[PDB]
Design a protein around this ligand. Structure first.
Ligand SMILES: *[C@@H]1O[C@H](COC2O[C@@H](C)[C@@H](O)[C@@H](O)[C@@H]2O)[C@@H](O)[C@H](O)[C@H]1NC(C)=O
Ligand code: NAG
Ligand code: NAG
Ligand code: NWA
Ligand code: NWA
Ligand code: CHH
Ligand code: CHH
Lengths: 536, 535
């Protein structure tokens, strides 16, 4: 019994496991329950705190993955499969993971809390890319990740109901945050220095915690990678949530009438029956749209993210935000005709016009015409390479890049300290084809430091790069500034402001400072298209 | 007892011209030749009638009267405005044309260039110094013809469907001059089977309307449109709008049945009409003119738009182009914040106000779309970017994108098209630097004025002028601006829908570029119409 691996938390004793990191050992405590299993009658309900336990709880292995859709687009393909559940599916899934330096840090260390993505319909903290051992060992950080309910189980809502009030998966996250405040000092973490970071729907989640007051006493800084609370996919109105939940119920045979009766019938259904019809409730043929997501309930979210970002005070907050070079490519293969991992995806103009209706599903005929006309290269209007890359750009700008620029600008104007980046390095080991470039999600492995494990076959320069990023992120966690406090120069990473709009490129070369994140194009999405809606 | 080489007979009778000095030698000039009956009195607003023959020898040694017009008062005494003002007496008796030819006249039939002046269809004269045909005549051996045509109410006031004021009579004045060339230009040594029209601004729009009107098409073979087009927001009005403007003008001068209204307008002093002419525009605007060509179903059988889209132009060669800063000239005539006497650094508020004045038909949404497209979102309040964006707005809307549209529709419908952008700022320009290369400041170079040493242009500008004169006359002669002998010099390739090629005209050798403001002209020519159409 290694005494470094025995910790007492409020709920009882835990036994961790010592893991090998390239530089030395780390202590891992995996599968720690932070909530009562949200099963049976607790389905769709807010999480309750985990009852204390007797003896020593085994925290040496990852717990079950929250019940979710499993991808079938390309069976056997690592590029999709690496995001799929790597443990058994269960509704009994509310557990978290802590990595710490071995031996336990002598003085309180900054804590980084990872929140995974997956369109609020998928994901798990147990995926290999979210492995906290490298950050813990090399940077001396305490790293935490939690499972939170996804799909219908996390986000099905009949707004105003006691039984399915909405946003319970975000309440799962918050409960893990409260757990860290209460318990993390036992692992050597500093609860007065907590930094949330996440990607895609995880980044959106981090932004939802910034915009919800009860969460604000639970962290000090935030990192939003390729995702935002504002924007077209991350939230729904109460009316639309109700409509989707009612349709799903009808599809599985429930009950209509009374919320209580409808929700009671939904609780009788096998979990896979709910997942089988999850996708059939979206109003349009679309991509980058997800059926069950956070809802503007007037509680967790007191108003729309738009309203809350525009009128908030963010003076004692520091934020790091950014995007990858090709945010849209990933999603095109899941719905737009002409696109595939298995060919160069050179498309016709006709296929481009069609793809825009699917990639921008809420667009009117006139707004879709505006998008086609703005993204067409009028010197090469029917060139398939341009049309393919423009399709990627539309989806990426609409859903990620322009939402990020919006948020960055409002936070900075409202008093926040903001740093921005674009991530431009494509992994040498990527299994997706070249045309997809640097796809959504493929920065994470670098930030978590996987290239430091030589068994994985990254290059030497990829390892040096990973180490740079791990430092930016942990420096930001420590101080709210990603710049190294004693290293003279590297050119410095400047704060993003509304006047100068400075951001940096993260690639194999030294930091380069640029001005304006797609400034002209994001004026189209963020300023003009809204007026085109209001006017007509 | 007088110079035998200056005496010539035309259909109407005998003429006596004058021997003028050009720097490389003498030229012959026949100035003030009448081609129509004076459009005065009961003939006001009526189509032109051919000139009745005269007895004896008509003196054609001086320019005739300028067609009655508004005289610019913006900057009194200032050469930049005054050079475009009338330089002879204003009269409604103004339908005269001018011919320049080599001295002695050519022995073999020579290609003819016909100049049609601009000035918004409200102004201009063939007698202005910048339209001096002596250098083209002397240096290129050209026969150059320029006519006066009626402008303003006199040329373009229309009550459509009426007999007495049918509209477009200023265009008919031009047409009659073209008919005169066909009948008479051989007497001067010109080739009536090789006639090239060229003109600038409204003059260019006019050339385009001759292309689109069948009776004119038998009267020339090739065309050059400089900074203007028949299509676009300013060159034509609908029948209904012409009538509305005609009728309001009538009211403002005390003329409340078409025959009666028109009979009453014919009794009014010409100056009374000019004095109220600007009051009939529907909006506070720039680059808009009260009395212009009307879509009458006759001269123009349909809208220039419909005619460029459905025409067969297989037998047409055209040279078209623009200057670097089409919009700047117009800003000082009505956008608050702009002046010749300072740098015109404007605020964002002044930019938004200026967009409404420069795009006066735009709804609020279209105007917002224009502002967002032309804003630099990195420096959205920078007064220098805002000034220059105001300029680009007015220029792209009124000139550059209409020209792009015309060039593409002509090329797709079978025409051979050549396109340019003119980028040299005359060293002698009196407008301030911020105005760049303004609308109209290519003309002096094409006409070869730098060749006159009294004008103080640079040596490099003389050589540039000579190059331009060659492109224009080569095109006139062969329908190709390139010299067939000169191989290694860069070539000017035709404009096509696929490649969109065009050349820069400056002190450097020809540089081929691709796409004439392709992205921005997509906004003006493809999107804004759909925004209108949907709303
Ligand atoms: C630029 O001039 C505009 C036109 O009015 C004037 O011209 C200038 C040169 C001054 O002499 C003024 O006193 C004249 O009235 C002004 O409207 C504009 O505000 C001027 N620009 C600035 C910011 O000074
Ligand atoms: C690429 O692959 C998919 C399926 O194999 C196919 O549907 C698509 O048409 C292909 N691309 C083209 C347009 O050749
Ligand atoms: C041209 O230059 C001369 C000599 O310096 C000067 O006196 C004359 O006024 C100038 N003329 C013009 C046309 O500006
Ligand atoms: C985002 C909307 O959550 C999508 C993220 C998808 N993976 C594959 C990166 C997890
Ligand atoms: C055009 C609309 O006719 C304007 C031409 C103006 N000048 C000053 C160049 C003649
Ligand atoms: C991977 C996605 O973004 C969506 C997958 C869901 N469908 C396969 C039903 C589109
Ligand atoms: C120079 C022009 O474009 C027209 C000016 C006419 N007003 C001075 C009456 C506005």
């Amino acid at each position: 019994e290694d005494p470094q691996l025995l910790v007492r938390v409020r709920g009882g004793q835990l036994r961790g496991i010592r893991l090998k990191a390239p530089g030395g050992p780390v202590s891992a405590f995996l599968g720690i329950p932070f909530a009562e299993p949200p099963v049976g009658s607790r389905r769709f309900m807010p999480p309750e705190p985990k009852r204390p336990w007797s003896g020593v709880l085994d925290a040496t292995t990852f717990q079950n993955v929250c019940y979710q859709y499993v991808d079938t687009l390309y069976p056997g393909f690592e590029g999709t499969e690496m995001w799929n559940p790597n443990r058994e599916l269960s509704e009994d899934c509310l557990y978290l993971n802590v990595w710490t330096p071995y031996p336990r840090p002598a003085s309180p260390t900054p804590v980084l809390i990872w929140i995974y993505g997956g369109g609020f319909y998928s994901g798990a903290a147990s995926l290999d890319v979210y492995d906290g051992r490298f950050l813990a060992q090399v940077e001396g950080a305490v790293l935490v990740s939690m499972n939170y309910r996804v799909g219908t189980f996390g986000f099905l809502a009949l707004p105003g109901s006691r039984e399915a009030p909405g946003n319970v998966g975000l309440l799962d996250q918050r409960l893990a945050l409260q757990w860290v405040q209460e318990n993390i000092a036992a692992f050597g973490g500093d609860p007065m220095s907590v930094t949330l970071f996440g990607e895609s729907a995880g980044a959106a989640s981090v932004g939802m915690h910034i915009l919800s007051l009860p969460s604000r006493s639970l962290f000090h800084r935030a990192v939003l990678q390729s995702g935002t609370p504002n924007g077209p996919w991350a939230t729904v109105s109460a009316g639309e949530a109700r409509r989707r939940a009612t349709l799903l119920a009808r599809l599985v045979g429930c009950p209509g009438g009374n919320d209580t009766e409808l929700i009671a019938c939904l609780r009788t259904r096998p979990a896979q029956d709910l997942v089988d019809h999850e996708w059939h409730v979206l109003p349009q043929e679309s991509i980058f749209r997800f059926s069950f997501v956070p809802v503007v309930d007037g509680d967790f979210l007191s108003d729309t993210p738009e309203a809350l970002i525009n009128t908030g005070d963010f003076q004692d907050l520091q934020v790091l935000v950014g995007v990858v070079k090709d945010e849209g490519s990933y999603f095109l293969v899941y719905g737009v005709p002409g696109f595939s991992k298995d060919n160069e995806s050179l498309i016709s103009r006709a296929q481009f016009l069609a793809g825009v209706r699917i990639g921008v599903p809420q667009a009117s005929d006139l707004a879709a015409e505006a998008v086609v006309l703005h993204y067409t290269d009028w010197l090469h209007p029917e060139d398939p390479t341009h049309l393919r890359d423009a399709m990627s750009a539309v989806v990426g700008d609409h859903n990620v890049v322009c939402p990020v620029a919006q948020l960055a600008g409002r936070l900075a104007a409202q008093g926040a300290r903001v740093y921005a980046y674009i991530f431009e390095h494509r992994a040498s080991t990527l299994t997706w084809p070249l045309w997809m470039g640097v796809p959504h999600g493929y920065e994470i492995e670098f930030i978590f430091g996987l290239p430091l494990d030589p068994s994985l076959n990254y290059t030497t320069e990829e390892r040096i790069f990973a180490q740079r990023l791990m430092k930016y992120w942990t420096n930001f966690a420590r101080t709210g500034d990603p710049n190294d406090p004693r290293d003279s120069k590297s050119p410095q990473w400047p704060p993003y402001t509304t006047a100068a709009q400075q951001y940096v490129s993260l690639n194999l070369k030294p930091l380069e400072v640029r001005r304006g994140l797609r400034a002209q194009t994001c004026a189209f999405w963020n300023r003009f298209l809204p007026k085109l809606l209001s006017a007509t």
